[PDB]
Design a protein around this ligand. Structure first.
Ligand code: MIY
Lengths: 1043, 151, 144, 96, 48
């Protein structure tokens, strides 16, 4: 192949151009997103039961659906919660690699068959089934700065005018509205109802009868009478359209002929479908949209389309309506793109600099400048063929591959310059000889590096999905790199390089360059001198090698591991939790203080606070809230003190003084769809019908035990909500029957008045919406109000609720949890400083084994992955080692010589560990993939040293010591030029701060340290490895030359 | 004030002792009028009951619906706590806002022993709730022949 | 595929303007287009024009005074004039539907409306003419 | 059966349409509701969409809106069909 | 049409470029391809 293209340099150019063309097109067309799919696919079933308590939801809805969730493929686990807002969410999580469409369809199909068993009130709200593990693309807020709209007015505008044009926008797929379209609200007055001997039953009946859409056939309808001349639709009752029409619904015609209208017993207004959530944006009423990215969609295209679409809409907004963008991952992603292209461009420049420093002509510096972009561009085409996207992980995979690509270019060019100088051959013929020295090794290296990077791709779960992104990117670029080194760079060497006179080493040059050549020629002789003396006493250095191997192991077990570094994503979260029974108004004052703090004490860093009153991360309820804080751009937040991590620690400190609530600020994880990373995720499970109270007791037992091991477990806490007072009202059946009051009228009166009831639909400005009845607030606040509601007996008398009921306080749950269909309580926690999450987990299981009989447990989330993915790391690296050995055995035609390459592995690893340890970083995924690429480069350096030495003995008959020294003499320069370019090119990543610097620092630091010790140590140790391995495994005259 | 209530709800002894030792109102009532004694009787923390009574906790505190710690303890079968409360002056015939007495509640659950203790302490066996029902009526309606006898 | 030739345009009510105002806008566009026969040819709506329909209003007060339930009224009107699927029967071994409807000659003309009677709570039969009124208006036979 | 265009549109068509989201590769949706008491809602997908997956996603969203339709409509059957396929033949049956 | 008009020029631009490149490789020459590529109008005028 190299000879073919040396003779056809235009054909070689055409192949490189077509590669670049394919990659450039792939770049224009591939999906771009912050991360690919990493979280295991999850499907969430959501239902609502207006007015229902947690237990009612759980026992009429949640259990019913759960009992039908079987016969579903690739299911890992199922979890659910049922809460006091009358909401249930059941989440089914599937194995990594499950096709999410098939999982959603199988869940829906099983749900579908259970729908006739759910209360009609739940069926009528809609039971949704959504892919819930997809990432948030943006959060749009909508406010009215004229101050003329409630959150209900704004939510209606968004629902009716905005939300569907967004769903139709290019690449969107899934949209959550903050609030609801309008409902017609009928706010009943029990005093006026009783005055006319009416109940909510009568109100509901009248609405269903007088807000109705009737099918009435046709005049002249078919089959018609002969001779019919007229055909017309008959139009009878049609849905009502306004508060005025609902107000004139006729409830009753009195004895004296007078009329009771709906507006005589109720206030009537357009309002929300429910009022459990107050949403504010910088203290103003707000609605909005949570917008998810569809699987495998382009995020930069979708975001820019959404924003132009909303601009298509702005002219038609009512006065004051304003669109805000508190969350959009687009800026952070573009930062990431820009930083990686920057790193790539400056790597190219530094390779030019090192090429000209050592080879001193601009002609040679052009070839790596051509080859590396060709390979980079082309890697995109390979990614496209395999269906990957451009994302944080694939992009850092490319920057981690720069060392390997730069090396293929340097190795080809430098070896031709060496052959010309040492033999006076002309470029064309020097390139043919040089490719003959190295191309077999290049092909072996490709197979070896495959063996290093491919096994990664077969890790399971989420972390398997992350590694696979690096594994396919790096292997693809490396494979393309070797192709380019056999096709294009030889052709370019032959045609572009200028001859060098035999023996000319530039020492007769003037100025800096002549000084440098004499300096470097002298340095090489000192190097070979030093190696030659090392080879006189190899046993001593073997001992030094063991020392290094031991220290590496020591550093390895002391380095804490982690997942992905936290980033400053320009947003963070603050949670708000008030005591049991606390009301919405009280939560609102706390949220108003949180908002005020950020917009005054952090006026310089904070752009907005999006405050939600009524849901939190522990659950929902009037005593829960969230404040989503969006910061000013990173550029206007200079300094460590103005980054998310510092802002959030101040806020939490500042909010320690607030005594009427628990308020905590925290950063997002790097991959928000995953949450977590840190700690463990434990499920305590009632496996014997013990009931909720006995479960809580067991939980409290476990929690106290854990607190007695702060040496190992830290912050073991329940994830959800504590029991709270609830008002238990008992209907006396005997008294109801004695009075002639039907239980149906009682329960409907109580539920419709206090819980509210969806009656039927109406048409609001051409759009179908819901009608709700409920008591006006002031007649449904306190237990005293219960007795103001009257029910009509069979004999016509009105009977107050107090005549047939009684009440008392008790405790119950506002949020019931279940795990794999059994009652459960989720417990969060983590390992104490300097402990393994694996051993913390072991302690949890031991504590848990002491709990009462019938209480079991399981691991979920981050911990389920670990508990099913720990045996992988040793056996996959065992596979890698074996295949590397085998590739080397084939390359060298030898079962023993492979060892002299394979021993290089610790040399780079010790430097990586030192740089991470010195810098206080962790063993995380960027560190791990850096390790493999450092190890890859060091092994490649060793393969070529050993290849040159073996070929000197085989094809030129030189003795062991002479071949070894000549080999390392020839390799010193290309080894040093790659290492210098690569160490310099990673330097900006080591020192980077700001947007994305968590990842940059993690890829740069272990690579820089490991490149240093791999370079410095390998150039002395692999001559030793080769000499000692050849001496230990041989037979006849290898120390002496021969013919 | 509030630390006592949740301490007594949680069942955390030395805390409670430290809080009267630091001056916490034993008669502090949450939003539904439950006192630490209500909470301790409810959940069944016998030793806590003794410590608050030892510290002057109103043995006949009532919540916003008229119910007393003895009601809670009788209802849920905490026999020893019923005895303790009764030895410390618990009104054996206290009525909540529904007319319901500890005897009614204990009868409704079938706690024969509590019923006998309450009777021994002078529970009015003929006390009627707002619907005219006595503990005997409850036992008949429940079918509990053992209880129906004692009454 | 149909089509090939020409263009296919959708006019859209994006502000709750309602069907009548939409038709007006449409007619405006259609007349403008007709004033450029140099460029546009045969610009026409794809669907149907509004037609007379018979609007019948039930008087709730009179129905309640007579003791006639609205359910009986709307079922009588719909079942007789529109027809109603009741339940299934078996025809030569095969399940099929049962429908009730008025015989054609009692559901042709507005005069026929008053021949239908509804039974009040007190047992008297009340003709539709006692509690309803009617007028002509325009509406759409095909809403897009 | 028996319904006018507006009645069809406001008790059936709008209800179903409000639940047609969360559907992949959708280019546009159009509907008509007429005086014969009939509605047809047509969802058109990008060239290259797998038609089985599109039909299943539409059906699934329809399924969840079925309890909100009048019982008279549910009882007629609400069908979901691939409508862009070509006609193979038209057979007539007469009695001479 | 409203979403498929930018395609025709850029896809034929791609065709032209790849044809040139294949010819350059066939002939080992950046210029000789032009002497084939100029034939394109000759057949097109007769079709038109
Ligand atoms: C948990 N989730 C998707 C959020 C997040 C932020 C929010 O600000 C909100 C929700 C739920 C949504 C659902 C909507 C719902 N719908 C689209 C009309 C709905 O009626 C409910 C419900 N879950 O019953 C709401 O609470 C709701 O009105 C609401 O206020 C929400 C809301 O404000």
């Amino acid at each position: 192949m190299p000879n073919f293209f040396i003779d056809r340099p235009i054909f070689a150019w055409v192949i490189a151009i077509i590669i670049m063309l394919a990659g450039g097109l792939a770049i224009l067309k591939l999906p771009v997103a912050q991360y690919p799919t990493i979280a295991p696919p999850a499907v969430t079933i959501s239902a609502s039961y207006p007015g229902a308590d947690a237990k009612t939801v759980q026992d009429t809805v949640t259990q019913v659906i759960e009992q039908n969730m079987n016969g579903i493929d690739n299911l890992m686990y199922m979890s659910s919660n049922s809460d006091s807002t009358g909401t249930v969410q059941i989440t089914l999580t599937f194995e990594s690699g499950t096709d999410a469409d098939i999982a959603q369809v199988q869940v829906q199909n099983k749900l579908q068959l259970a729908m006739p068993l759910l209360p009609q009130e739940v069926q009528q709200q809609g039971v949704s089934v959504e892919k819930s593990s997809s990432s948030f693309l943006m959060v749009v807020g909508v406010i009215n700065t004229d101050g003329t709209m409630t959150q209900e007015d704004i939510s209606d505008y968004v629902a009716a005018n905005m939300k569907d044009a967004i769903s139709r926008t290019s690449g969107v797929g899934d949209v959550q509205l903050f609030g609801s379209q309008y409902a017609m609200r009928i706010w009943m007055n029990p005093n006026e109802l009783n005055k006319f001997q009416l109940t909510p039953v009568d109100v509901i009946t009248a609405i269903k009868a007088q807000n109705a859409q009737v099918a009435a056939g046709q005049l002249g309808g078919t089959p018609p009478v002969k001779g019919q001349q007229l055909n017309a639709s008959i139009i009878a009752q049609t849905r009502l359209t306004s508060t005025e029409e609902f107000g004139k619904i006729l409830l009753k015609v009195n004895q004296d002929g007078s009329r009771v209208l709906l507006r005589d017993v109720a206030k009537i207004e357009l309002g929300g479908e429910n009022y459990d959530i107050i949403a504010e944006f910088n203290g103003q009423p707000a609605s909005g949209l949570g917008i998810k990215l569809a699987t495998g969609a382009n995020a930069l295209d979708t975001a820019a389309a959404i924003r132009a679409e909303l601009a298509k809409m702005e002219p038609f907004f009512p006065s004051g309506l304003k669109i805000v963008y508190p969350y959009d991952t687009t800026p952070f992603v573009k930062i990431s793109i820009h930083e990686v292209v920057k790193t790539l461009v400056e790597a190219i420049i530094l390779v030019f600099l090192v090429m000209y420093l050592f080879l001193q002509n601009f002609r040679a510096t052009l070839i790596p400048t051509i080859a590396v972009p060709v390979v980079l561009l082309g890697t995109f085409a390979v990614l496209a063929a395999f269906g990957f996207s451009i994302n944080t992980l694939t992009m850092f995979g490319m920057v981690l591959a720069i060392g390997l690509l730069v090396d293929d270019a340097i190795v080809v060019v430098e070896n031709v310059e060496r052959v010309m100088a040492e033999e006076g051959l002309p470029p064309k013929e020097a390139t043919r000889k040089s490719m003959g020295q190295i191309q077999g090794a290049l092909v072996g290296i490709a197979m070896v590096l495959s063996a290093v990077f491919v096994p990664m791709a077969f890790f399971g779960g989420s972390t398997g999905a992350i590694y696979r992104q690096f594994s396919i990117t790096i292997v693809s670029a490396m494979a393309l790199s070797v192709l380019v080194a056999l096709i294009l760079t030889p052709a370019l060497c032959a045609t572009m390089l200028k001859p060098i006179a035999k023996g000319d080493h530039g020492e007769g040059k003037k100025g800096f360059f002549g000084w440098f050549n004499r300096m470097f020629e002298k340095s090489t002789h000192h190097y070979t001198d030093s190696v030659g003396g090392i080879l006189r006493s190899t046993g001593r250095y073997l001992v030094l090698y063991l020392i290094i191997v031991v220290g590496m192991a020591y550093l390895f077990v002391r380095l804490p591991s982690s997942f992905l570094p936290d980033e400053d994503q320009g947003v963070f979260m603050t949670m708000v939790q008030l005591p049991a029974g606390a009301t919405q108004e009280r939560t609102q004052k706390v949220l108003n203080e949180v908002t005020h703090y950020y917009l005054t004490k952090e006026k310089n860093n904070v752009e907005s606070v999006f405050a939600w009153n009524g849901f939190g991360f522990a659950g929902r309820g009037q005593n829960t809230g969230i404040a989503f804080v969006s910061l000013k751009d990173w550029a206007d937040r200079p300094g460590e003190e103005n980054k998310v991590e510092a802002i959030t620690m101040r806020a939490t400190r500042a909010f320690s003084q607030i005594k009427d609530a628990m308020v905590f600020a925290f950063n997002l994880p790097a991959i928000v769809e995953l949450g977590t990373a840190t700690g463990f995720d434990f499920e305590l499970i009632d496996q014997a019908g013990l009931g909720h109270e006995k479960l809580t007791q067991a939980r409290n037992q476990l929690l106290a035990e854990a607190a007695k091991h702060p040496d190992m477990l830290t912050s073991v806490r329940p994830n959800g909500l504590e029991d709270t007072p609830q008002f238990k009202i008992d209907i006396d059946q005997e008294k109801a029957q004695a009075l002639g009051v039907s239980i149906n009228d009682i329960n409907t009166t109580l539920g419709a008045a206090w819980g509210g009831s969806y009656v039927n639909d109406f048409i609001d400005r051409g759009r179908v919406k819901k009608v709700y009845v409920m008591s006006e607030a002031k007649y449904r606040m306190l237990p005293d109000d219960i007795g103001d509601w009257y029910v009509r007996a069979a004999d016509g008398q009105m009977v107050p609720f107090s005549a047939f009921s009684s009440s008392r306080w008790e405790y119950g749950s506002p949020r019931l949890e279940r795990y794999n269909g059994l009652p459960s309580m989720e417990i969060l926690g983590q390992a104490a400083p300097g402990k393994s999450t694996g051993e913390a987990m072991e302690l949890m299981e031991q504590l848990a084994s002491k709990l009462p009989t019938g209480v079991g447990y399981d691991w979920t989330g981050m911990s389920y992955q670990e508990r099913l993915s720990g045996n992988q790391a040793p056996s996959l690296y065992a596979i890698s080692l074996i295949v590397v050995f085998l590739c080397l055995a084939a390359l060298y035609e030898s079962w023993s010589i492979p060892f002299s390459v394979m021993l290089v592995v610790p040399l780079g690893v010790i430097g990586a560990l030192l740089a991470a340890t010195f810098r206080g970083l962790t063993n995380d995924v960027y560190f791990q993939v850096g390790l493999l690429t450092t190890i890859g480069l060091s092994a490649k350096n060793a393969i070529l040293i050993v290849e040159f030495a073996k070929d000197l003995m085989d094809k030129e008959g030189k003795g062991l010591i002479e071949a070894t020294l000549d080999a390392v003499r020839m390799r010193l320069r290309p080894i040093l030029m790659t290492s210098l370019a690569f160490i310099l090119g990673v330097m900006p990543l080591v020192i980077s701060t700001g947007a994305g610097s968590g990842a940059q620092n993690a890829v740069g630091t272990g690579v820089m340290g490991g490149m240093v010790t791999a370079t410095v140590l390998a150039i002395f140790f692999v001559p030793v490895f080769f000499v000692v391995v050849r001496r230990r495994f041989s037979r006849k005259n290898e120390d002496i030359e021969h013919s | 004030g509030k630390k006592l209530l949740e301490a007594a709800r949680a069942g955390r002894d030395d805390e409670v002792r430290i809080l009267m030792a630091n001056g916490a109102d034993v008669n502090a009532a949450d939003v539904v009028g439950w006192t630490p004694l209500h909470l301790a009787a409810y959940w069944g923390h016998l030793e806590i009951v003794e410590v608050l009574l030892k510290n002057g906790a109103d043995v006949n505190a009532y919540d916003t619906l008229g119910s007393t710690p003895l009601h809670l303890a009788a209802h849920f079968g905490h026999l020893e706590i019923v005895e303790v409360l009764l030895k410390n002056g618990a009104d054996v015939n206290a009525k909540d806002d529904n007319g319901i007495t500890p005897l009614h509640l204990a009868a409704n659950r079938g706690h024969l022993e509590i019923v006998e203790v309450l009777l021994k302490y002078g529970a009015d066996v003929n006390a009627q709730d707002k619907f005219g029902k006595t503990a005997f009526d409850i036992s008949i309606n429940n079918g509990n022949e053992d209880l129906a006898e004692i009454l």
